[PDB]
Every structure is written in structure tokens, then in C-alpha cells.
Specification:
Blueprint (H helix, E strand, L loop, with lengths): L1 E6 L7 H16 L4 E6 L9 H8 L4 E2 L25 H9 L1 H5 L9 E16 L13 E4 L3 H9 L3 E4 L5 H7 L4 E4 L1 H6 L8 E17 H5 L3 H36 L3 E4 L2 H11 L3 H8 L1 H9 L4
Parallel strand pairs: 1-2, 5-6, 5-7, 8-9
Antiparallel strand pairs: 3-8, 4-7, 4-8
Helix pairs in contact: 1-9
Length: 305
């Protein structure tokens, strides 16, 4: 039996958590015991950063990290972190399906990482212990960000303080005041109960959390061809399921946060959104050389159906 250990940092009741569990179920139902799958959620086996070290070492065989967590392996995936680049997940999906977007799945093959698929989670919103209605509202705040130079600079541009922290540490960081605010999808906020430590949310859709399903190129390329292709077909089916569940789980997450009564959500007006974009988009100039004109052109073109 070939064992595939799939580690991740999110709760089970999420797009990625359900996706990993579906992959395991379909492998069990279709590969007759030739492949077995173990799933380790919520940083139970490996958390941020460590997971990739383990992937390269062979302590794990499959991951699906946020596209914001690959700067140590390539700087091309940074495109997904640029604020307000993608209007919505439909635009990002279009970019991901472009020749360029597909090519990015192999951007790290030279470091031993193979991308197998993109999984959607959703757009990012803002959270803090004070209201965030106008960009000046973020000044002085300490925001937890994923380990991303783009996201670090995003809040630096708003005259705020950025703290790169592993996802598992967000709740405690906010409860203890190491950080005062953050950014994430409704699913991640509710699934991790972070609304209990954030009284104010702003629906800004200023970015997104999407994932690249990845594996160790040596493990995957060493699989029997029939098994590899079958696993890829199953992954393709799982991707559709994740992408469909993602939008609805995020909708349910927002409703449960609003129902809580312990947190408020302000939705930005078109004009407010534009002012936040005008204030944050200057960060793009710092990374344009890394991503390149072509990728930026393709990403901007993805906003036009």
C-alpha cells in the first residue's frame, strides 16, 4: 500500500478540510487499497512553514498551502497576494486557468515541489478591535499576516504594523494583544472562533485566500503511472467539490459571525472600496519586477469575463 499523508492548518469544517477528507474517501472507494490516505487537520501534524520542510523531507506527501506562503520557493506566486488585483474568485479562477496560471503549478518543480491543482477558499476581509471604515482607520494597528512580504508591505503602506504569524497562533495573538487585527476569509474567522476576539469586521474583499495543492515531485513521479493518473483524476473531481463548497461555507460563516452579536460587520461602499484600493495599490510597485508585466496583464485581464 502507498501511503499519502495530507497535512493542513485549517479546521475540518472548511473548504480545504472537507477537500482533504473527500480525497481520502474517493481513494479508499476507487483504488482497492493500493493507496491509503491519512489526513492531519488544524496543524495537528505540521503547521505553517514546517509543513513545506516536511514535504521536502518526505515526512508528508501532500499539502495545500495558501498561495501567500511560497516566497521561499518562487516569487511568481506573489501575484495572488496583490491587493485588489482580482475583483472576485471568478476572476482568480480565470487567471488560474490561463496558460500562465497553469504554468505556475510547476513554478517550484526545480525545488522538488509539484502543483497538482488550485483550490479556492474565498476573498479576504479585515478585522480589528476598532472600526475599519476608512483607510486612515488602520494607522498604528498591529495586523497578523501570513508569512508574505506582499502582505507585510500591504499594511506597512497603510502606516500599520504587520506581524507574520502562523495561522494556528492567530487566536491567542489577538486575545493577548500581540496583534489587534488581521485579514482572512469568513470561513477561517468563524471556523477558528476568531470573531470572539475581533469586535469589528469590514467586508473589503481586498484580496483572497486560495491554495495550491502540492506534493513532493520525487514521490509523485515515482508512483506507478496508472495510480498517479487515477489520483490526478480524483484530485480533479475533488477540486470541483472544494470550489463549490467554498462559496457556501464562507456565506454560512459570515451569517454565524453576524448572528453572534459580539462582532459587527461593515460592508464597504463602492466609493469606500476605491479609496482603500487607492491607498493600498501603491504596494504593487514593490513586487511588479518579481511578477512581471505579462502575469500582471493576464491577472488584470481576468477581471473581464
Amino acid at each position: 500500500p502507498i501511503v499519502i499523508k495530507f497535512s493542513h492548518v485549517v479546521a475540518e469544517n472548511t473548504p480545504k478540510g472537507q477537500g482533504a477528507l473527500l480525497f481520502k474517501k474517493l481513494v479508499e472507494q476507487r483504488l482497492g487499497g493500493r493507496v491509503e490516505v491519512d489526513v492531519y487537520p488544524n496543524s495537528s501534524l505540521f503547521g505553517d512553514g514546517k509543513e513545506m520542510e516536511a514535504l521536502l523531507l518526505g515526512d508528508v506527501q501532500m499539502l495545500a498551502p495558501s498561495l501567500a506562503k511560497f516566497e521561499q520557493y518562487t516569487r511568481k506566486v506573489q501575484i495572488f497576494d496583490l491587493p485588489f488585483l482580482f475583483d472576485d474568485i471568478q476572476a482568480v479562477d480565470r487567471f488560474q486557468r490561463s496558460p500562465q496560471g497553469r504554468a505556475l503549478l510547476t513554478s517550484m518543480q526545480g525545488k522538488g515541489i509539484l502543483g497538482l491543482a488550485y483550490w479556492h477558499n474565498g476573498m479576504k476581509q479585515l478585522s480589528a478591535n476598532r472600526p475599519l471604515l476608512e483607510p486612515e482607520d488602520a494607522r498604528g494597528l498591529k495586523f497578523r499576516v501570513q508569512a508574505s512580504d506582499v502582505l507585510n508591505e500591504q499594511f506597512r503602506q497603510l502606516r500599520a504594523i504587520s506581524r507574520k504569524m502562523s495561522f494556528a497562533e492567530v487566536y491567542q495573538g489577538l486575545q493577548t494583544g500581540v496583534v489587534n487585527g488581521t485579514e482572512n476569509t469568513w470561513s477561517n474567522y468563524e471556523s477558528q472562533k476568531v470573531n470572539e476576539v475581533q469586535k469589528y469586521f469590514t467586508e473589503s474583499n481586498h484580496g483572497l485566500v486560495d491554495y495550491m495543492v502540492i506534493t513532493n515531485a520525487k514521490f509523485w513521479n515515482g508512483l506507478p503511472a496508472d495510480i498517479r493518473e487515477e489520483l490526478q483524476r480524483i484530485m480533479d473531481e475533488v477540486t470541483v467539490q472544494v470550489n463549490l463548497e467554498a462559496e457556501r461555507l464562507n456565506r454560512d460563516a459570515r451569517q454565524r459571525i453576524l448572528a453572534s452579536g459580539a462582532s459587527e460587520i461593515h460592508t464597504l461602499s463602492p466609493q469606500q472600496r476605491a479609496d482603500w484600493r487607492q491607498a493600498m495599490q501603491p504596494v504593487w510597485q514593490k513586487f511588479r519586477g518579481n511578477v512581471g508585466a505579462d502575469l500582471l496583464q493576464a491577472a488584470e485581464a481576468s477581471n473581464r469575463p
